Amino acid sequence: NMSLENVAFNVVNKGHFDGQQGEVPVSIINNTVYTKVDGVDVELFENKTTLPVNVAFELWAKRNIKPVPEVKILNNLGVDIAANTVIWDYKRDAPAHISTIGVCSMTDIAKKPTETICAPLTVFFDGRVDGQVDLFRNARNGVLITEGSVKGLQPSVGPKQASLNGVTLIGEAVKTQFNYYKKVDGVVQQLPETYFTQSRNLQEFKPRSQMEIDFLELAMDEFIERYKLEGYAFEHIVYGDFSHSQLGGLHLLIGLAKRFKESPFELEDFIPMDSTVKNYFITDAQTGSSKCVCSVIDLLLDDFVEIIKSQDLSVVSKVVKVTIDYTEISFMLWCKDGHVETFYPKLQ
Amino acid sequence: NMSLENVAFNVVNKGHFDGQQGEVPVSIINNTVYTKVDGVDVELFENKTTLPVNVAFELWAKRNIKPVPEVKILNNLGVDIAANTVIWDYKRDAPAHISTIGVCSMTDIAKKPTETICAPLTVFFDGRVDGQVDLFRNARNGVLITEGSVKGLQPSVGPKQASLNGVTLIGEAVKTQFNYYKKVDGVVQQLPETYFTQSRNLQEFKPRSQMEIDFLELAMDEFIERYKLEGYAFEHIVYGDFSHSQLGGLHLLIGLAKRFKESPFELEDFIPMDSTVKNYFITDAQTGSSKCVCSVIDLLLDDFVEIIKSQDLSVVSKVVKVTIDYTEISFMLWCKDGHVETFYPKLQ
Amino acid sequence: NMSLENVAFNVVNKGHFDGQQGEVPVSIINNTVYTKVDGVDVELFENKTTLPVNVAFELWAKRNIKPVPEVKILNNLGVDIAANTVIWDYKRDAPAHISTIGVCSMTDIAKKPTETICAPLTVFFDGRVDGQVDLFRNARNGVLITEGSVKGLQPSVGPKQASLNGVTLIGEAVKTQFNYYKKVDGVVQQLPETYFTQSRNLQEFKPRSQMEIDFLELAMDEFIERYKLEGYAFEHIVYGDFSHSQLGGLHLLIGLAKRFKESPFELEDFIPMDSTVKNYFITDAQTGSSKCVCSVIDLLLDDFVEIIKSQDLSVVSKVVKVTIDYTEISFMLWCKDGHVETFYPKLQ
Amino acid sequence: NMSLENVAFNVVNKGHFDGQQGEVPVSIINNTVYTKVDGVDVELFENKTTLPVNVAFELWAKRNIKPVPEVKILNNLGVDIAANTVIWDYKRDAPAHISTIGVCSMTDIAKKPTETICAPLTVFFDGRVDGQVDLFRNARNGVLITEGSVKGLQPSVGPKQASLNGVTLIGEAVKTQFNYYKKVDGVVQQLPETYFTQSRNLQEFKPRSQMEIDFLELAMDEFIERYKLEGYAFEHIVYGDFSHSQLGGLHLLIGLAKRFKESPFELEDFIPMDSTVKNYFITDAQTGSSKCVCSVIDLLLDDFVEIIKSQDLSVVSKVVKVTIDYTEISFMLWCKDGHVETFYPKL
Amino acid sequence: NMSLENVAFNVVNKGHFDGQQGEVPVSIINNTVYTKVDGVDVELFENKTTLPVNVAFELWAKRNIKPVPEVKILNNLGVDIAANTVIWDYKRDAPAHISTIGVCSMTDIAKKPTETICAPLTVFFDGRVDGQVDLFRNARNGVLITEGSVKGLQPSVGPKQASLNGVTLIGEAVKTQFNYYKKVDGVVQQLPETYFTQSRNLQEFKPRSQMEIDFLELAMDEFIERYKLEGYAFEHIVYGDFSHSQLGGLHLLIGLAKRFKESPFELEDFIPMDSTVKNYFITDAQTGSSKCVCSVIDLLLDDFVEIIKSQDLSVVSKVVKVTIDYTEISFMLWCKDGHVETFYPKL
């Protein structure tokens, strides 16, 4: 069940825990696990978690190495724990969940998700593993992903992308789009209509629609005229205003990506975790414009246009609710004289 | 006055300390501050200072987030402490000064700079803050920056650039060029004529004059002929000599920047701090030429040309003094038969 | 013999230990050595070794700063210890050897390699240092490098590249190709014929033959036809197969380098050390193809072609032995119907 | 205004957390909490727990400073968590329980014991606190102590002693004997009839009956004759046999106390925690007799005599179950020819 | 040739820093200093301070090993720093002062006390060291101790006891009673008339007057009658009241010493530092009586009797100021009907 030296043997020989027999010599110093290779010590793992170093080492070695839902999705769906696996949170360099089921003797609260202690918890089930669909059917609270149809259950089509060893990708050699199912108190839920964030990053941003291609290629005024965006404050919200000491707008990742290719800037990720909305302390290196809390979301530009064009613009300020990544994201909408002033998501 | 959980609340909600009421749960493990977000721990701060972790966390959260003088300037002007702010040293990942005034109960030596304990110390005053010009007028020892004129005081025009959240920049949406004033023992000082370093970096180096543009674009022999630099050893001092085991010359940042675009090399910053002169252990990857102590300064090329063309070349070796960043920098000048052999700054 | 403050003085003033007299104030906190510079603490060294922080600091300061053999070569030749120097292992951020000879009072097992305790150990001798060739002649077990001929000893021509301050390079201003000699139990050995790995890296990979230039420039099918590689599974072994969930082949660095310029991927170096064969956990970001243990070797493409074209292809699977970096590397060769299926090195 | 600096203010000014307003400067280094007193740092708390230093500091400051059941009693009753207090485990220098209810934002799983997350946990309730008897009635799983009767509930009289700030004592100025009640799955459970251990220690051991006074003062042969203990191997079980390399017997604390006054020995407490039965690696300094696992229990000698005399001595070896401190303690009984060879508890 | 390895050489060979030449190999791990002795590591120093381990090691090695004033005296006199020595605080296992003068490159603010940076600090000067009386005369702020008269300066006779390597003692082979002098803002300051605490401890408490001998040997009623202490609540203040849940009185160390010989109790020193008044969280093991903040002072019983008998007993409650160890100690006096209820010092 447990053996630090056997975990290290699997890491050295298989790249992760693979259930192989064997042992290697291990040193633990502070928060770092070493193994002896021909007379000298080689670092295997640096603990960045709040768990004991040897426990975090084992959970990391036993991480799920298939494509799995991004942590923000599991969090938004209320997942508390995973059935017989570890979802490793690469944004936090730590397990996504505090406890485990049938993984590690120090963190297990149960060997199987059918045990009583798991009933009030929302357990994550993976239909790609034999028997887990049936475990979901019998579980009181849970979230299930599948690659195909489940008899008698209507699916919710999830995002196109998933996380594979910390790399978020849309799979071509592997399936990353899952069907989602959720049960609460033994009742199968109808998951709401939702947008999905695109989980792209600033430096290798790639467009996923013709509008996004046009946004990156065309000048600001050409793009706004082509897609008839006059009065929606896209100059402020998406392109960003760098003329004053406080940086204006800049709430869509594609706008940051366009600026970054032209002029670099600093993004301080002061709450480093996976979430649908991200807050950054941004400092523009060219102008000196800055903002302590700049909320950023990566929506497909077409989706963001649909959202802002579907709002009433008759009051000065109000909260707009948008279902994104299965959760209700609050946006602040500021208007003046029937046109938009700004529109930004809130991290909550 | 003091509350670790309130500091963390401000960091999470405002990106820095903003004087807001509230608390979040905090964990301190070794030298890392965490906060609990929906059942899991998220890292807020890793202490790299020699201060206690919770104290360094508070000083970092209370850092000045306006454009401020670079630490090398404050050090050269003899600044010991700041009035009611924290100058964060991003080169050292630590406070620029050991003690504080009216910032933190663990590090404060006073609540106000008018207290007796501050009289012998050179206190930094910021004229952009209400009342600090008057505090400078009454202070015994101090350095004051302003954006405009001060009645009855002659200013010293400082560098064009300043530091904003660790980004050194010439402000366009914000003012980064300050007037400087200094008092010693109650007497307003005449600050000397000085050159200023340009605070650029190796990889995104940008020219700031036509001579620098020509240096980057033209070949070595074309540039030297155009600006009539024969006999000043620019081939050695600025371009660098990579033909022997010991790397020759290479003491101006623009010369390193030109080499780096053509051929990468290793720069070991073995004294990592902000200073007018920097010493690097350099290893050229293409040739294997190396040098344990390679002194580098980032002067505007036009300024460096003026300096070296203003020296007497009649002795084999001597020390040349140049006022740079308000301090007296010693250069070694080596000559032979009336022409320069080398010319380099000394870190002292 | 020993002085922590004197080691730090040499680091600050000379960039490494240089035998100079002097002292600076030092702070040791956890695993970090600091020195006080004008009232504030500056980090000099962060200990990443399993040694005490002050001991590792001294060994790092006393590292060899000339071109030295890469650690993988010394390990393959059985080197246990170095004569009167420290070979710093930049892959491990630690000394390459556990003990020293005449370097450090905490780690020395002897002052001179002629002492009895060194006789059973394979001592590394550097012919560029006065007297070390003669010490090798009198030593029982040892490895010697020279830049030129040694009277009465036949040399083995080593690799073209060597390590200079952690930068692996083929020297142009300095000599990096050494003659190698080895003695075991007082008997000079005949070192075997061997290939050498090229020690290049993924991102600045440079071809070293016309075949490698053609591999990077031509399309897959053009290159295979030009060099008549039909039936040798180069599409699988070198170019890689990204069509299935398990990534196929990709065992030569030049193939990874070609893929990386076109499409980025993740390489997890889960045994971070210097070795002739490297194992990576690879995840392709474009396709999602991945493999937990992907063995990679950087052979000159011409050498790899010679190796695979010199094998018998008549059995389904067998182990092939290839002398590389002076050690016997085991390759697995898989064949079907007289053609290659795959061919990969094993890390052992 | 809950804060690290406010916790430290209460410790400095009140000796523990007392809900007072105020702050003092705090430094956290080396898993230790310091406060600044006239320019220099004074240590307030060294963390010996597996919790973060600032969290353990707060739980320690918020420890219950009234007499509370010993941790071994709470463990034997299956207590998982306490309602709105912290039971500090002075044998482990750590909280007795991992989580809290309405104590600390970092460790709370709930603010009140009525929340659903507490239902499957056995919550400790203190009838001396207003409202906690009613919370016990509504809790699905729990343990309740009171100083008096609770209408309708059948009580179990607990041990005479309790723990006050880490001092186990029989209260004279305070009450330390409580009624006990327990609920499992929403149903009140009958607590078993039980002996209680005496919770004494080697150095300041004091007899609590005439038989224990006789054992300490009389010689071995005289005591066994007076209390008619022939055939029960008291020479082995209680007095101990130091004649062989392996130390024989010595399973009652009073026997260790008698030996210790005569000749010192080493007791390695290799599982340092509060428990009804303790295991020690014992080395006798005079003879060199030793034993890696010597199980020791502190029963009133009268109780142990009552237990062993009630045994059937016709079997070579059998396991005997005795309820002690509300838990079932297994004893190994070795006999030969109708007399006892040895009789020892198991951990 | 000042160095970490040279400090360790002096510790190993001389027991402290003695200015000798030499070096030994040193390892620094776990906030601890080791040296290699015949192949294995031997611990020389465990850092308990908030300074870096190698810095604290040097300051400890350079500690003053002559009799020096107790830290509570230096604190009460406002001492900020010492001239060319280290006063080691054995109650905190740390330097008594943050910075140094001419001791250690990492902590020095100056090489000599005459430097301008020292002028606003109260520097401790030791007249037993050549030149330090003259440095006191030139210092703007300072405290001076001497073994004899200084011409022109009016002395204050200090306590009989001093601290030698952490042992507080009244010297017989060495002098421990010093003259004291103090300067503020360049002006010599008259030190007040003062009592001194006796600096005794619970275990090895020894009486130092016939009244203290009587207190330990006589019964409570007999002692109060002989010394005519009726109406002064000595039963409460000194002997302590253990009859209620809250422990009453017990504010003089001699009263704790008398109780401790009779029955043990726990004293939690939750602010562990040297101070004229100490606060303890006390738990009586026999009765269970306890008190979170019990202020205790070790005055000669004759001095305490002199203090309390000089009091006006006509007010329900008032604060009484008494100069002790050169500082103003506030006492709370509670009276009723012309007799004392309680009388305790405040920290």
Ligand SMILES: O=c1ccn([C@@H]2O[C@H](CO)[C@@H](OP(=O)(O)O)[C@H]2O)c(=O)[nH]1
């Ligand atoms: O009258 C107001 C007040 C605030 N804001 C907007 O509210 C946000 C927080 O102050 C800012 O939006 P931004 O971050 O996109 O620039 C600001 O412009 C308005 O638009 N109008």
Ligand SMILES: O=c1ccn([C@@H]2O[C@H](CO)[C@@H](OP(=O)(O)O)[C@H]2O)c(=O)[nH]1
């Ligand atoms: O006769 C001498 C001795 C030294 N140097 C120069 O002094 C510096 C330190 O040795 C080197 O300058 P560099 O770093 O720019 O190459 C060296 O060339 C001379 O020019 N001439």
Ligand SMILES: O=c1ccn([C@@H]2O[C@H](CO)[C@@H](OP(=O)(O)O)[C@H]2O)c(=O)[nH]1
């Ligand atoms: O019948 C078999 C079994 C295994 N392999 C090969 O053996 C290796 C480990 O399974 C893989 O080679 P690769 O890493 O280059 O893809 C696999 O294709 C074969 O070629 N044929």
Ligand SMILES: O=c1ccn([C@@H]2O[C@H](CO)[C@@H](OP(=O)(O)O)[C@H]2O)c(=O)[nH]1
């Ligand atoms: O046949 C047996 C086997 C074991 N034991 C007893 O079982 C215990 C563990 O081996 C020992 O009892 P002690 O610790 O009190 O000396 C041993 O004497 C017997 O008495 N008889």
Ligand SMILES: O=c1ccn([C@@H]2O[C@H](CO)[C@@H](OP(=O)(O)O)[C@H]2O)c(=O)[nH]1
């Ligand atoms: O009316 C009052 C209020 C307080 N106290 C006393 O003040 C102290 C703190 O409450 C206690 O004194 P003790 O610690 O010596 O017992 C208490 O009895 C009185 O005597 N009378």
Ligand code: NA
């Ligand atoms: Na339970």
Ligand code: NA
């Ligand atoms: Na003072």
